[PDB]
Design a protein around this motif. Structure first.
Motif, PDB file in Angstrom:
ATOM      1  N   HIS A 224     -14.675  25.378 -18.813  1.00 38.63           N
ATOM      2  CA  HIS A 224     -15.965  25.329 -19.195  1.00 38.63           C
ATOM      3  C   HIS A 224     -16.248  26.967 -19.841  1.00 38.63           C
TER       4      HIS A 224
ATOM      5  N   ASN B  87     -25.659  26.583 -17.200  1.00 37.85           N
ATOM      6  CA  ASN B  87     -25.241  28.055 -17.513  1.00 37.85           C
ATOM      7  C   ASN B  87     -26.281  28.843 -17.399  1.00 37.85           C
TER       8      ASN B  87
ATOM      9  N   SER C 151     -18.035  28.817 -21.034  1.00 43.29           N
ATOM     10  CA  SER C 151     -19.224  29.466 -21.297  1.00 43.29           C
ATOM     11  C   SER C 151     -19.394  31.179 -20.723  1.00 43.29           C
TER      12      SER C 151
END
Length: 513
Positions: free
Chosen positions: A407, A386, A409
């Protein structure tokens, strides 16, 4: 009571192993916003189709501590990044105390401030997340990095569904007074607690290996690969198969692929090396939504550049902070650029392609043709890192409540939370001026000008993930320059202005990939 303090100043950072508790106290001020009115706001008629909006600005303010410099001092941040492989937020405690409501007369060109010991302030936390969430858009008005600095509470506002500058029936209006609220006089204080959800540790490390370099550099692979289609020493056709080894690492069979790619145009920090045109928008990487083009800024996490290309950056694929005293419009010299070069090991370079794929079927008459993949979605076997978090960058972002996500994030960097720390809305209770002696039904629009001051303390308990490396050689650590300078790094100047000279990440220790 009036003469009794309702709280104390707590500014500390206690380290306990696998745990650090950071408490930050700041002095805050709150004006009256919108003259205690809710105002419908929309984009102007001349605004472009991409910048149309419809929403509401409320008379409330909100507290924002969604930045790492709100809770970590530069020394504390250095402790965290130089000694831990990861960290996450565990507990939160919010306190509001020592509230003073003050009247302003502003008569005859001279303003006189007086104490209003009976006026209240309305405070409430949206623990049920029934209000639009705005603490995820890198907005200004957070807690100052320097504890000694007093800040102005930002005005709360939100956007709803719009059709151009107009609203549709699906558009929602929210009155914050409709929520239960706690009313505080000068003697009262407000307190609440929050627990973060189990969230992955943030990667506070860089990889010591690249994804394409995980093999043993001494042994050969028992698998074969097509090394040649044309036999050497003439134009003769034959399928030659070779076992890939140390000298053919590029041709070795692998188990993993670099993360997804969404290519961005490259810009050089040397202006003379860039094309002589204004392509900040035309050449930018965007996404299409409801007939609107929106920048993919910073977008999918990708390496800012490759080896020996530090002076290249993606058109909009990097977080750019402002230097102290920088205006809202400045040049490159007045901004600080983050670099995600630590994730070259697993992430594609933001400015390069993901790869090449066959675009046809070759034959004795039709030669092979390749096509460059400038945008590759998730593939099986993909691995990636990330975006790095930064001391002056965001901490958390609310995950949109949707049927599906991939995901979740935050792209700007931080922790994605389905139930993040709730917004804390604060407002000055209206205090009407003298009413008319004869009843009138007209809306009351005569108010005694007031503002508020107070102290706000935020305590966050973070869980630390300890480094356990067997690396023999010394690691790269964040450090301050030892050379002489006119101003100490991360301090005040002769004018008392606090400065953050450069951005600090977390990826200084290393992990095996």
């Amino acid at each position: 009571g009036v003469g009794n303090a309702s709280g104390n100043w707590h500014c500390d950072s206690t380290w306990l192993g696998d745990r650090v508790i950071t408490t930050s106290t700041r002095t805050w001020a709150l004006p009256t916003y919108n003259n205690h009115l809710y105002k419908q706001i929309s984009s102007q008629s001349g605004a472009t189709n991409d910048n149309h909006f419809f929403g509401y600005s409320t008379p409330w303010g909100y507290f924002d501590f969604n930045r790492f410099h709100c809770h970590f001092s530069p020394r504390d941040w250095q402790r965290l990044i130089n000694n831990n492989w990861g960290f996450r937020p565990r507990k939160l405690r919010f306190k509001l105390f020592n509230i003073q409501v003050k009247e302003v007369t502003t008569n005859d060109g001279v303003t006189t401030i007086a104490n209003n010991l009976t006026s209240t302030i309305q405070v409430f936390s949206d623990s049920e997340y029934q209000l639009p969430y705005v603490l995820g858009s890198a907005h200004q008005g957070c807690l100052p990095p320097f504890p000694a600095d007093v800040f102005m509470i930002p005005q709360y506002g939100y956007l709803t569904l719009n059709n151009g500058s107009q609203s549709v029936g699906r558009s929602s209006f929210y009155c914050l007074e409709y929520f239960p609220s706690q009313m505080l006089r000068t003697g009262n204080n407000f307190e609440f607690s929050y627990t973060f959800e189990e969230v992955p540790f943030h990667s506070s490390y860089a990889h010591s290996q690249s994804l394409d370099r995980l093999m043993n550099p001494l042994i050969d692979q028992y698998l074969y690969y097509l090394a040649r289609t044309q036999s050497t020493t003439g134009s003769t056709r034959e399928l030659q198969f070779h076992q890939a080894g140390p000298n053919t690492m590029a041709e070795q069979s692998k188990n993993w692929l670099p993360g997804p790619c969404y290519r961005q145009q490259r810009l050089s920090k040397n202006i003379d090396s860039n094309n002589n045109s204004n392509f900040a928008w035309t050449g930018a990487t965007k996404y299409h939504l409801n007939g609107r083009n929106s920048l993919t800024n910073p977008g999918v996490a990708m390496a800012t550049n490759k080896d020996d290309e530090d002076q290249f950056f993606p058109i909009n694929g990097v977080l750019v902070f402002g230097k102290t005293g920088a205006a809202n419009k400045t040049t490159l010299e007045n901004v600080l650029m983050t670099s995600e070069e630590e994730i070259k090991t697993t992430n594609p370079v933001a400015t390069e392609e993901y790869g090449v794929v066959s675009s046809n079927l070759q034959s004795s008459t039709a030669g092979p043709q390749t096509q460059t993949v400038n945008s590759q979605g998730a593939l099986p076997g993909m691995v990636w890192q990330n975006r790095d978090v930064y001391l002056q960058g965001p901490i958390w972002a609310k995950i949109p409540h949707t049927d599906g996500n991939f995901h979740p994030s935050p792209l700007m960097g931080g922790f994605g939370l389905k139930h993040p720390p709730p917004q804390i809305l604060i407002k000055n209770t209206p205090v009407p001026a003298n009413p008319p002696e004869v009843f009138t039904p007209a809306k009351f629009a005569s108010f005694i000008t007031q503002y508020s001051t107070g102290q706000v303390s935020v305590e966050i308990e973070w869980e630390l993930q300890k480094e356990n490396s067997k690396r023999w050689n010394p690691e790269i650590q964040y450090t301050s320059n030892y050379a002489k300078s006119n101003n100490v790094e991360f301090a005040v100047n002769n004018e008392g202005v606090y400065t953050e000279p450069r951005p600090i990440g977390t990826r200084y220790l290393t992990r095996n990939l």
